[PDB]
Write a protein that binds this ligand. Structure first.
Ligand code: CLA
Ligand code: CLA
Ligand code: CLA
Ligand code: CLA
Ligand code: CLA
Ligand code: CLA
Ligand code: CLA
Ligand code: CLA
Ligand code: CLA
Ligand code: LHG
Lengths: 40, 210, 208, 739
C-alpha cells in the first residue's frame, strides 16, 4: 500500500485529479448561475 | 512417462497433457498438471455418474407403473432450458431453488477447494462439530473419513486399487453417456429411453443414419 | 489461532488479532499502514453506531405504522414532515451542521493527539473528555462503570462490532427491498412469513 | 511439439509502479534532466532494448497483445451499448431511408446542445458515419435488448483477455520453445480461427441473418418479427420462407446439395430493395471459405509426422541466378519479431486498402450505398490505416537489418545478394519517379498553361488529345460479359461498376456503372508516381541502414540517430528512422489524392438523386472537364465544396467548422518543429532559467530542449493530424449536408 500511494503521488495521476477538480468546478460554475459575462 | 502406477492408466495421452515437462517451475501456476487433471477426471465422472442415472430414471419408472406420469418427464423438460419445457408445480419457482442450489453448493465446493489449496485446513476451524469428518488424506480426490467412507470398504490397499479404477471405468462410461443424452435429444427431440425402445423395434429404420 | 472469514487462508501480517472483530479480512491491503489503520477503526465504529441508532428508528416507526399509529415510511418522511413544520429548511440544516462541527472536530483532535481535549479548557473538564483508546472514549460517555474491567470490556467491543456490521447491512436491505416493492420493511417481513415459498426476491418483478 | 510453461516467474505487486524507468538500466538511476521523461514514454515498449533474452521478449509480447484485445472489446461493447441506450436504431429500422443514424447524444451545458441536430425519429443527437446500424441489420437485430447483452458479453470477455495477460505472464508464462512451434500456430490459426470462424458466421446468417432480413425487406414491422432463437426451435416457420429446411441435413450427408439452392445462391449483383449484396450469397461465401482454410490447416507436420516442413520447402526452391536462395530465412523469422512484424504490417495494410475498394463497389450491409457519408467515411478510414501500416514495414524492417542481422547466417543468400546490387535498385527506381512526375504531373501544367493562353484545343481532355485507358475499359467489359460465357451459373455480375443499369433505393442511386476517360488516366498514373517515390524513400533507408559510402558504420550508431556530424558537407537525416519520417509526408500526400479521387468522381459521375428523367448528380458531372486542370481541383473541389463547412456556424454541423480551423492551426504549428533546430531553443531556456532562478523558483529537474529526433517526430505528428483532420471536417460536413 505504501507503494500504491506512491504511484498515486506520481505526476500523470496527481494531474488527473487536478484536472477533474478544475474542469468539474468550472463546468459546475457554468451549469449554475448560467453563462456569466459582466460580474454584477 | 506413463508408468501405469495410477488406477486408470492405459497409455492413451496422444497430446501429452500429463507430461511432467510442462509447468516446469514450482508454485500454483496453471490448471494443466497431474495434480489437477487426475482430480477433475473423477469429479466429472462422479457428477456424471449421478446425472446419467437420474436423466433416465424418471422416464423408466414412468413407463413402469410405480411413479406418477406427471412427474416422470424428460430431463430437459423439467425446468432446465425452459424453452424446452418447465414443470409448473413444484413447491417453489426455479429461481428460488437456484439460490438454494448456489448457497448450499458454494459451501461444499469452496470448502473442498480450500482443502485442495491447503490440506486438512477445514478440520482445524470450528464448523458446527463436523470437523472430524473433514480430516482428508494425502490424495484431494479420495479423502475418506468417518463419513465419506463411513463403511470402510478397502481396508487392504490392493482392494482399494481395484475399487479406485472401477470408480473410473464405470464413470468414464457415464461421461460418454451424458454426451449421448445431449446429442440424442437435439436430433430426436425425445427422451433417451424412448430412443432405445425404437432401435429395439425398428433398428434399421430408427438410427442416426435416418 | 482464531476463526477467519475463509477457513485455511493465511491472515495478513498487520492484522495481529488484538482489534475487535478481526477475522483477517483485507484483500485490498487497506489499513496496512499504522496511521490508516488508526483511522479506519474509528470510521467503522461511527458507520456502525449511526446504523444502530438509525435502523432502530426505522423499525420503531414502521412497527408503529403497522399497528395503527401515525408514522410514515422511512422513505419520503422528510418530505411530508417539512410541509407542515414551523422550522424552515435551511435553518434546520445549519443548526445540525453547525452543532456537529463542534463534536466532529473535537473527536478529530483526540485522534491526531490523544488526551488533548482533557486539558480543562472546555468548561473545566479534565478527567473526562480524554480517550481511553482510539474510538472508545469514557468518563462522560460511560456514566455506568461498564468499562473499568478489561475482561468484560474486550468482549463488549466484540458485541458492539458484530451487532453493528449486521446493522449497516440491514440499512442496505431497506434501500434494496424498498426500490423493488415500495413497501415498508415490516410489511415485507410479514409477507415472507405468510407465504415463504412464493414471495421472495425472485417474484418481486425486479432483479430479473 | 508439446506444451511448455514456466510457473510463477514474476511477482505481482505495485513496487515497480512507484519506480518508473525500472525496465532500462539508464533510466533506473533517476531524473536529473527533463529528457528522462521523454525517454521513459518512448523506450517503454521497446522490449528488445530492455534485455537480450529472446524468451522474456516473447513473454512480454504475447501478454501485451492480450491488452489490445481487451482495449478493443470495451471499445466495441461501447458502440453496442451507446447504440442501445443513446440511439435511434428502432426508429431507423422502420424508416431507414428518411431517418439518419445517431449514437452520440450530447449534454445541455453552455452552447453545445445545437449539435444535437434534428436527426429524425423523435430523437436528436450527433449523426454518425460508422455504418453500425447497417451492420446490426445485416445480422438479426430488431430490439435494443439484443445490444445490451452484446455489450455485457464484451466486458466479460475483455476481463478474461486482461486476466489472460496477467496469467500468461505473471503466473504461468510459456517458454521460448512454445513460441517457436510456428508450424503448430499456422494450422490452429488457419483451420480453427479463420476456418471455423467463417463456418460459424455462415450458421448465424443461415439461421438468423436470412429469416429476419427476408421479412424486414417484405415490409413486415420489426416488432412483429419472430425472435432469432425461435427459428432454430421451429422447423416449420423457416420452412415457409425457405422450403429446403424441411428435408433436414439429409441432402447434406447424401451429397444432394442442389436442394439447398434456395438459400445457398450465386445470384451476384445487389438487392433491388436495400441496395446491398444478397444475404444468401454471403452465407455461401463464408461456408466455401471455411472448407478452404480447413484443408489448409492440415498442411504443416506439427506432431503426427505427415505433411510439409517449412524449412525443407524454403531451402529447396533454389535457382542459378540466385545461388543459395531462401535458405537462412527460417532461422531469421523464428528469431526476430521485427522481421515477422514488417511482413505482417505490409499485408495487413494493403488488405485494408483492398477492403476500401471492394466495399464501395460491392456494398455488403443493406442501406449503406444510400448513406453517402457512411460510404465515404469507411473508404477514407481503411485507406489511411493501410498507409500507416505499410510505412511501419519500412521502419520495422530496418530495425532487423541493424539489430537482428547476422552476416554469418547470410552468405550468398537472397538477403545478401539484394544488398550487393542495392545501388542498381535505387538508381533504376530514381529514373522511374522522374519519368512519372514529368509525364504525369507535367501534363497537368500543360493543360493549365494552354487554358490560360486561350488554347483549349491543345489540352489533354475528352474533346481533345485523348489518352484513354484501353486496358481498363477492356477489363470492365470482360467482367461484365462474364455471366454469359466464363461464369454461366452466375445470374449476374459481381458489381454494377463494370456495366449494367442503375440500382435506385429511396430515390437515391446505390451504384451505377463508372466510366473511365482521359482524366481517370492521368489520376491512376499520378497514384503510381506517389507510390514508386514512397517506396524509394523507405527502401533506400532499409538497404543503406547498415552501411553506406558516406558512413560505412551506421549499425554501430543505431537505428535512430540524428546525424554523424557537420562533416562530409553534412550528415543530417541519414539514419533509417529519418527515412521513415520522410516517407510519412509522401505517404500522407499519396493517400490524400486517393481520397480526392473518390469524392469528386463519385459525387459527379455516380451519386445523386434519380428522377423520372435520368439521374441528377451532385456536381453535374464536372469531373471530365475540370479535373484536367489543377485550377479545377482548386475551384470546383475546394472553393466549391467548402461552402457547407464555412456556413456551418449556427447549425448541428458547427463542430466541423471548428475542427476545420483547429486542424489548420495544428498543421502550421508543426512547422516550428520541422523548420527550426534544438540549438536556438536551448539557449532561450537559459535566459528564462535566469528569471526563474532570480526569484528562487527553479526546478531541480533541469529544463532541456526537445531532442533532434523528437523534434522531427513532433512535427510529422502535429503535421499529419492537422492535414488529416481538415478532410475529416471538409468531408463529413459536405456530405451530411448532401450537396
Ligand atoms: C455410450 C454412449 C451412447 C449410447 C449407448 C448411444 C445409444 C444410442 N444413440 Mg447415441 N450418441 C452418443 C453416445 C451414445 N449413443 C454420442 C456421444 C453422441 C454424440 C456424437 C450421440 C448422438 C446420437 C444421435 C444424434 C442419435 C443417437 C441415437 C442413438 C440410439 C440409436 C443408435 C443410433 O442410430 O445412433 C448411433 C450414433 C452414434 C454416434 C454411435 C457412435 C457413438 C459411440 C458408441 C460413442 C462415442 C465413442 C467415442 C467418441 C470414442 C472416443 C474417441 C474420443 C476420445 C476422441 C441409441 C439408443 C439415435 C436415436 O435417437 O435413436 C433413434 C440418434 O438419432 N445418438
Ligand atoms: C500555428 C503555428 C505557430 C504557432 C501557433 C506558434 C506559436 C509560438 N511561437 Mg512560432 N514559429 C512558427 C509557427 C508557430 N508558432 C513557424 C512556422 C516558425 C518558423 C519555423 C516559427 C518560429 C518561431 C520562433 C523563432 C519563435 C517562435 C515563438 C513562438 C511563441 C511566441 C510566444 C507566444 O506567442 O506565446 C504563445 C502563443 C500561443 C498561440 C499559445 C500557443 C498554445 C495555445 C495557447 C494552446 C494552449 C494549449 C491547450 C490547453 C491545448 C493543450 C492540449 C494538448 C497539449 C493535448 C508561440 C507560443 C517564439 C518563442 O519562443 O516564444 C517565446 C520564438 O522565439 N516561433
Ligand atoms: C497512459 C498514457 C500516458 C499519457 C498520455 C501520459 C502523458 C504525460 N505524462 Mg505520463 N506516465 C505514464 C503514462 C502516460 N503519461 C505511465 C505509465 C507512467 C509511469 C508511472 C507515467 C509517468 C510520468 C512521469 C514521471 C511524468 C509523466 C509526465 C507526463 C506529461 C508530460 C509532461 C508535459 O509534456 O507537460 C508539461 C507540463 C507543464 C509544462 C506544466 C504543468 C501543467 C500540466 C500540463 C497540467 C497537468 C496535465 C494533466 C496531467 C493532463 C491530464 C492527463 C492526460 C493524459 C489526460 C504528459 C501529459 C510528466 C509530467 O509532469 O506530467 C505532467 C512527468 O514528469 N508521466
Ligand atoms: C483569454 C481567454 C478567455 C477568457 C478571458 C474567457 C473568459 C470567459 N469565458 Mg471563455 N473560452 C475560452 C477562453 C476565454 N474565456 C476558450 C479558448 C474557449 C473555447 C474552449 C472558451 C469557451 C467558453 C464557453 C463555452 C463559455 C465561456 C465563458 C466565459 C465567461 C465565464 C466566466 C465564468 O466562468 O464566470 C465566473 C466564474 C467565477 C467568478 C469563478 C472563477 C474564479 C474562482 C472561482 C476563484 C468569461 C468572461 C462562459 C460565458 O458565459 O461566456 C461569456 C461560457 O459559456 N468560455
Ligand atoms: C490467443 C489467446 C490464448 C492463447 C494462445 C492461450 C494459450 C494457452 N493457455 Mg490460455 N487463456 C486465455 C487465452 C489464451 N490462452 C484467456 C483469454 C484466458 C482467460 C479465460 C485464459 C486462461 C487460461 C488458463 C486458466 C490456463 C490457460 C492455459 C494455456 C496454455 C495451455 C494450452 C491449452 O491446453 O489450451 C487450452 C485447453 C483447452 C481444453 C481449451 C478449452 C476451451 C474451452 C473454452 C474451455 C496455452 C499455451 C493453461 C496453462 O497455463 O497451462 C498450464 C491454464 O491453466 N489459459
Ligand atoms: C444431482 C443430481 C440430480 C438432480 C439435481 C435431480 C433433480 C431433480 N429430480 Mg432427480 N434423480 C437423480 C438425480 C438428480 N435429480 C437420480 C440419480 C435419480 C435416480 C434415483 C433421480 C430420480 C428422480 C425421480 C424418480 C424424480 C426426480 C425428480 C427430480 C426433480 C425434482 C426433485 C425434488 O424436488 O426433490 C426433492 C426431494 C427430496 C427428497 C429432498 C429432500 C431434502 C429435504 C430438505 C429433506 C429435480 C429436477 C422428480 C421429477 O421428475 O420432477 C418433477 C421425480 O419424480 N428424480
Ligand atoms: C446442477 C443443477 C442442480 C443442482 C446442483 C441442484 C441441487 C440441489 N437441489 Mg435442485 N433442481 C434442479 C437442479 C439442480 N438442483 C432443477 C432443474 C429443478 C427443477 C426446476 C430442481 C428442483 C429442485 C427441488 C424441488 C428441490 C431441489 C433441491 C436441491 C438441493 C437438495 C437438498 C438435499 O439435501 O438433497 C438430498 C440441492 C443442493 C431441494 C431443495 O431445495 O432443498 C430444500 C428440493 O426439494 N431442486
Ligand atoms: C484503428 C483501426 C480501425 C478502426 C478504428 C476501424 C473502424 C471501423 N471498421 Mg475497420 N478494419 C481495420 C481497422 C479499423 N477499423 C483494418 C486494418 C481492416 C482490414 C482487415 C478493417 C476491416 C474492416 C471491414 C471489412 C469492415 C470494417 C468496419 C468498420 C466500421 C464498423 C466497426 C465494426 O465494428 O464493424 C465490424 C466489422 C465486421 C463485423 C466485419 C469484419 C470482417 C473482416 C473481413 C474480418 C477479418 C478479421 C480477420 C481475422 C483479420 C484479418 C486476417 C489477416 C490474415 C489479414 C468502423 C467504422 C465495417 C464497416 O464497414 O462498418 C459498416 C466493415 O465491414 N473494418
Ligand atoms: C457453426 C454453424 C452451424 C451451427 C452451430 C448449426 C446448428 C444447427 N443447425 Mg445448421 N447449417 C449450417 C450451420 C450450422 N448449423 C450450414 C452451413 C448449413 C448449410 C448446409 C446448415 C443447414 C441446416 C439445416 C437444413 C438444418 C440445420 C439445423 C440446425 C439445428 C439442428 C441441427 C441438427 O438437427 O443436428 C442446429 C441448432 C436444422 C434445423 O433447422 O433445426 C430445426 C436443419 O434442418 N442446419
Ligand atoms: C506491375 C508491373 C511491373 C512491370 C514493370 C517492372 C519492371 C522492373 C523489374 C525489373 C527487375 C529485373 C531484374 C529481375 C531480377 C532477377 O534477375 O531475378 C531473377 C529471376 C529468375 O529467378 P530464378 O528462376 O533464377 O530463381 C528463382 C528463385 O531464386 C526463387 O526464389 O527473374 C525473374 O523472376 C523474372 C522477373 C521479371 C520482373 C518483371 C515482372 C515483375 C512484375 C510481375 C508481373 C509481370 C507481368 C505483368 C503482366 C500482367
Amino acid at each position: 500500500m505504501k507503494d500504491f500511494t506512491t504511484y498515486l503521488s506520481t505526476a500523470p495521476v496527481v494531474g488527473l485529479g487536478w484536472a477533474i477538480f478544475t474542469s468539474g468546478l468550472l463546468i459546475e460554475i457554468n451549469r449554475f448561475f448560467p453563462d456569466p459575462l459582466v460580474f454584477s | 512417462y506413463l508408468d501405469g502406477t495410477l488406477p486408470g492408466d492405459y497409455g492413451f495421452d496422444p497430446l501429452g497433457l500429463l507430461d511432467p515437462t510442462v509447468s516446469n517451475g514450482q508454485g500454483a501456476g496453471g490448471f494443466v498438471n497431474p495434480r489437477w487433471l487426475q482430480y477433475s477426471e473423477v469429479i466429472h465422472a462422479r457428477w456424471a455418474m449421478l446425472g446419467a442415472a437420474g436423466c433416465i430414471a424418471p422416464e423408466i419408472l414412468g413407463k413402469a407403473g410405480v411413479i406418477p406420469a406427471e412427474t416422470a418427464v424428460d430431463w430437459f423438460r423439467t425446468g432446465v432450458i425452459p424453452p424446452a419445457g418447465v414443470y409448473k408445480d413444484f413447491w417453489a419457482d426455479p429461481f428460488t431453488l437456484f439460490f438454494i442450489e448456489v448457497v448450499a453448493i458454494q459451501f461444499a465446493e469452496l470448502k473442498r477447494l480450500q482443502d485442495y489449496k491447503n490440506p486438512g485446513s477445514q478440520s482445524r476451524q470450528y464448523f458446527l462439530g463436523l470437523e472430524g469428518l473433514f480430516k482428508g488424506s494425502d490424495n484431494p480426490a479420495y479423502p475418506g473419513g468417518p463419513f465419506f467412507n463411513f463403511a470402510n470398504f478397502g481396508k487392504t490397499e490392493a482392494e482399494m486399487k481395484k475399487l479406485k479404477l472401477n470408480e473410473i471405468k464405470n464413470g468414464r462410461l457415464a461421461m460418454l453417456a451424458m454426451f449421448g443424452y445431449g446429442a440424442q435429444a437435439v436430433i430426436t427431440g425425445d427422451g433417451p429411453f424412448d430412443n432405445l425402445l425404437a432401435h429395439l423395434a425398428d433398428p434399421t429404420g430408427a438410427n442416426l443414419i435416418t | 489461532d482464531r476463526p477467519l472469514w475463509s477457513p485455511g487462508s493465511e491472515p495478513p501480517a498487520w492484522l495481529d488479532g488484538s482489534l475487535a472483530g478481526d477475522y483477517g479480512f483485507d484483500p485490498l491491503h487497506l489499513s496496512e499502514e499504522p496511521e490508516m489503520r488508526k483511522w479506519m477503526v474509528q470510521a467503522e465504529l461511527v458507520h456502525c453506531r449511526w446504523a444502530m441508532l438509525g435502523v432502530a428508528g426505522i423499525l420503531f416507526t414502521s412497527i408503529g405504522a403497522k399497528a395503527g399509529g401515525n408514522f410514515p415510511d422511512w422513505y419520503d418522511a422528510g418530505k411530508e414532515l417539512q410541509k407542515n413544520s414551523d422550522i424552515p429548511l435551511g435553518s434546520l440544516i445549519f443548526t445540525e451542521l453547525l452543532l456537529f462541527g463542534w463534536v466532529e472536530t473535537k473527536r478529530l483532535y483526540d485522534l491526531r493527539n490523544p488526551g488533548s481535549q482533557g486539558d480543562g479548557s472546555f468548561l473545566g473538564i479534565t478527567d473526562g473528555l480524554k480517550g481511553k483508546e482510539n474510538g472508545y472514549p469514557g468518563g462522560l460517555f460511560d456514566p455506568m462503570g461498564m468499562s473499568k474491567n478489561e475482561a468484560s470490556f474486550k468482549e463488549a467491543k466484540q458485541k458492539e462490532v458484530k451487532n453493528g456490521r449486521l446493522a449497516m447491512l440491514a440499512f442496505v436491505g431497506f434501500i434494496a427491498q424498498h426500490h423493488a416493492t415500495h413497501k415498508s420493511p415490516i410489511d415485507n417481513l410479514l409477507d415472507h412469513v405468510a407465504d415463504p415459498f412464493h414471495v421472495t426476491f425472485a417474484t418481486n418483478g425486479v432483479s430479473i | 511439439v508439446k506444451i511448455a510453461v514456466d510457473r510463477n516467474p514474476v511477482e505481482t505487486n505495485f513496487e515497480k509502479w512507484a519506480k518508473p524507468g525500472h525496465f532500462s538500466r539508464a533510466l533506473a538511476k533517476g531524473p536529473n534532466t527533463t529528457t528522462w521523461i521523454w525517454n521513459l514514454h518512448a523506450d517503454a515498449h521497446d522490449f528488445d532494448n530492455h534485455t537480450s533474452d529472446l524468451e522474456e521478449i516473447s513473454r512480454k509480447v504475447f501478454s501485451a497483445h492480450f491488452g489490445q484485445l481487451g482495449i478493443i472489446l470495451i471499445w466495441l461493447s461501447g458502440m453496442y451499448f451507446h447504440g442501445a441506450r443513446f440511439s435511434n436504431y428502432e426508429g431507423w429500422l422502420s424508416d431507414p431511408t428518411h431517418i439518419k443514424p445517431s449514437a452520440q447524444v450530447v449534454w445541455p451545458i453552455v452552447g453545445q446542445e445545437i449539435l444535437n441536430g434534428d436527426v429524425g425519429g423523435g430523437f436528436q443527437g450527433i449523426q454518425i458515419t460508422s455504418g453500425f446500424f447497417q451492420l446490426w441489420r445485416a445480422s438479426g437485430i430488431t430490439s435494443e435488448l439484443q445490444l445490451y447483452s452484446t455489450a455485457i458479453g464484451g466486458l466479460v470477455l475483455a476481463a478474461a483477455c486482461f486476466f489472460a495477460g496477467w496469467f500468461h505472464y505473471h503466473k504461468a508464462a510459456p517458454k521460448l520453445e512454445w513460441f517457436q512451434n510456428v508450424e503448430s500456430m499456422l494450422n490452429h490459426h488457419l483451420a480453427g480461427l479463420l476456418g471455423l470462424g467463417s463456418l460459424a458466421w455462415a450458421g448465424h446468417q443461415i439461421h438468423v441473418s436470412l429469416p429476419v432480413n427476408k421479412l424486414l425487406d417484405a415490409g413486415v414491422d420489426p416488432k412483429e418479427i419472430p425472435l432469432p432463437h425461435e427459428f432454430l426451435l421451429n422447423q416449420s416457420i423457416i420452412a415457409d420462407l425457405y422450403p429446403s429446411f424441411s428435408k433436414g441435413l439429409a441432402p447434406f450427408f447424401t451429397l444432394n446439395w442442389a436442394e439447398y439452392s434456395d438459400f445457398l445462391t450465386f445470384k451476384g449483383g445487389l438487392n433491388p430493395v436495400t441496395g446491398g449484396l444478397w444475404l444468401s450469397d454471403t452465407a455461401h461465401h463464408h461456408l466455401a471459405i471455411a472448407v478452404l482454410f480447413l484443408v489448409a490447416g492440415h498442411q504443416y507436420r506439427t506432431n503426427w509426422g505427415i505433411g510439409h516442413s517449412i524449412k525443407d520447402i524454403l531451402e529447396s526452391h533454389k535457382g542459378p541466378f540466385t545461388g543459395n536462395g531462401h535458405a537462412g530465412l527460417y532461422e531469421i523469422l523464428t528469431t526476430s519479431w521485427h522481421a515477422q512484424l514488417a511482413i505482417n504490417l505490409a499485408l495487413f495494410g494493403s488488405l485494408s486498402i483492398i477492403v476500401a475498394h471492394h466495399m464501395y463497389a460491392m456494398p455488403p450491409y443493406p442501406y449503406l450505398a444510400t448513406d453517402y457519408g457512411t460510404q465515404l467515411s469507411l473508404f477514407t478510414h481503411h485507406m489511411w490505416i493501410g498507409g500507416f501500416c505499410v510505412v511501419g514495414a519500412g521502419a520495422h524492417a530496418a530495425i532487423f537489418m541493424v539489430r537482428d542481422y547476422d552476416p554469418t547466417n547470410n552468405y550468398n543468400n537472397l538477403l545478401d545478394r539484394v544488398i550487393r546490387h542495392r545501388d542498381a535498385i535505387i538508381s533504376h527506381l530514381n529514373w522511374v519517379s522522374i519519368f512519372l512526375g514529368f509525364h504525369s504531373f507535367g501534363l497537368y501544367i500543360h493543360n493549365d498553361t494552354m487554358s490560360a493562353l486561350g488554347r483549349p484545343q491543345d489540352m489533354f481532355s475528352d474533346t481533345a488529345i485523348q489518352l484513354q485507358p484501353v486496358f481498363a475499359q477492356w477489363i470492365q467489359n470482360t467482367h461484365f460479359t462474364a455471366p454469359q460465357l466464363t461464369a454461366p451459373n452466375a445470374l449476374a455480375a459481381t458489381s454494377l461498376t463494370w456495366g449494367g443499369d442503375v440500382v435506385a433505393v429511396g430515390g437515391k442511386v446505390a451504384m451505377m456503372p463508372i466510366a473511365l476517360g482521359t482524366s481517370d488516366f492521368l489520376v491512376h498514373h499520378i497514384h503510381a508516381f506517389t507510390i514508386h517515390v514512397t517506396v524509394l524513400i523507405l527502401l533506400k533507408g532499409v538497404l543503406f541502414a547498415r552501411s553506406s559510402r558516406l558512413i560505412p558504420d551506421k549499425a554501430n550508431l543505431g537505428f535512430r540517430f540524428p546525424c554523424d556530424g557537420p562533416g562530409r558537407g553534412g550528415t543530417c537525416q541519414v539514419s533509417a528512422w529519418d527515412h521513415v519520417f520522410l516517407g510519412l509526408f509522401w505517404m500522407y500526400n499519396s493517400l490524400s489524392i486517393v481520397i480526392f479521387h473518390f469524392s469528386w468522381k463519385m459525387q459527379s459521375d455516380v451519386w445523386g438523386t434519380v428522377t423520372d428523367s435520368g439521374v441528377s448528380h451532385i456536381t453535374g458531372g464536372n469531373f471530365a472537364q475540370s479535373a484536367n486542370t489543377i485550377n479545377g481541383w482548386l475551384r470546383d473541389f475546394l472553393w466549391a465544396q467548402s461552402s457547407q463547412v464555412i456556413q456551418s456556424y449556427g447549425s448541428a454541423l458547427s463542430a466541423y467548422g471548428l475542427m476545420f480551423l483547429g486542424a489548420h492551426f495544428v498543421w502550421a504549428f508543426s512547422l516550428m518543429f520541422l523548420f527550426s533546430g534544438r540549438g536556438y531553443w536551448q539557449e532561450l531556456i537559459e535566459s528564462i532559467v535566469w528569471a526563474h532562478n532570480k526569484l528562487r523558483v527553479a526546478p531541480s529537474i533541469q529544463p532541456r530542449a526537445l531532442s533532434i529526433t523528437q523534434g522531427r517526430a513532433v512535427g510529422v505528428a502535429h503535421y499529419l493530424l492537422g492535414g488529416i483532420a481538415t478532410t475529416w471536417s471538409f468531408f463529413l460536413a459536405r456530405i451530411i449536408a448532401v450537396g
